[PDB]
Design a binder for this molecule. Structure first.
Ligand SMILES: NNc1nncc2ccccc12
Ligand SMILES: NNc1nncc2ccccc12
Ligand SMILES: [Co+2]
Length: 240
């Protein structure tokens, strides 16, 4: 069709409309569904990203890299590229909406939430006799929170986009399965560590089993061996 912008430009426009009057323009549910529809059409070749295959990882190379596409105050738009056998560790997205689309390879995504009384749960404190492996230091026991592990599935470019909300599937872990993988990620609002909106990491405690099952979650510092460095984005530019 004549004069159509690139798909990635149109994704960026729609995320901007989604996450920021006669006739009435779309509301949030309609805009979210349109954003989702655009992401379902996106292929790696639309970003000029050749699928990557396996090559031992030198200790100085990042396990994961990041391609910056665009960002505003409303959203961030970029690509994460995982090397073989790497993992984006379990983390949350506080108060955020998220949408991701696998471009190549296969990822295991585990989706979780911390219990929230605003949803009709009655979150309880960890019981004192409940023990774990490894055992919990006293300051760690006080910091444990209950949560629920909702799903743990493999996703490829043929899967629908994966969506999260402030209150549903807000925690996830992404493991690269059977070689390298990459996905396009939209986050809204973006992280802002200077304004106290950081990426928080977690571990699921193993005590002393189908889904969904309740679990115990402990926040933890970013792992020593996890870091994500930028690399050039080769696809169509998002203007301006
Ligand atoms: N930004 N660099 C790094 N950040 N965190 C962990 C690292 C581990 C090995 C090499 C580089 C690392
Ligand atoms: N699910 N992906 C991610 N979500 N939030 C923050 C991230 C930071 C680094 C790498 C991946 C991230
Ligand atoms: Co994430």
């Amino acid at each position: 069709r004549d004069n159509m912008a690139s798909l990635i430009q149109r994704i960026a426009r729609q995320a901007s409309l989604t996450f920021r009057e006669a006739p009435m323009q779309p509301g949030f549910p309609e805009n979210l569904s349109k954003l989702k529809s655009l992401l379902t059409q996106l292929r790696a070749e639309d970003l000029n990203i050749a699928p990557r295959k396996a090559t031992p990882l030198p200790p100085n190379l990042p396990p994961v890299t990041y391609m910056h596409i665009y960002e505003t105050d409303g959203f961030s738009l970029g690509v994460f590229l995982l090397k073989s056998g790497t993992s984006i560790p379990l983390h949350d997205h506080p108060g955020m909406h998220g949408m991701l689309k696998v471009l190549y390879g296969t990822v295991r995504i585990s989706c979780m939430d911390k219990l929230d009384a605003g949803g009709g749960q009655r979150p309880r404190a960890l019981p004192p006799e409940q023990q774990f492996e490894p055992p919990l230091q006293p300051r760690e026991r006080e910091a444990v929170r209950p949560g629920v592990l909702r799903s743990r599935a493999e996703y490829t470019e043929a899967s629908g986009p994966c969506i999260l909300t402030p209150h549903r599937d807000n925690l996830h872990q992404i493991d690269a399965v059977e070689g390298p993988a990459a996905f396009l990620d939209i986050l809204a609002p973006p992280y802002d560590p200077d304004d106290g909106r950081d990426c928080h990491y977690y571990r699921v405690l193993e005590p002393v089993s189908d889904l969904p099952r309740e679990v115990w979650l402990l926040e933890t510092p970013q792992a020593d061996d996890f870091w994500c460095e930028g690399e050039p984005y080769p696809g169509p530019k998002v203007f301006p």
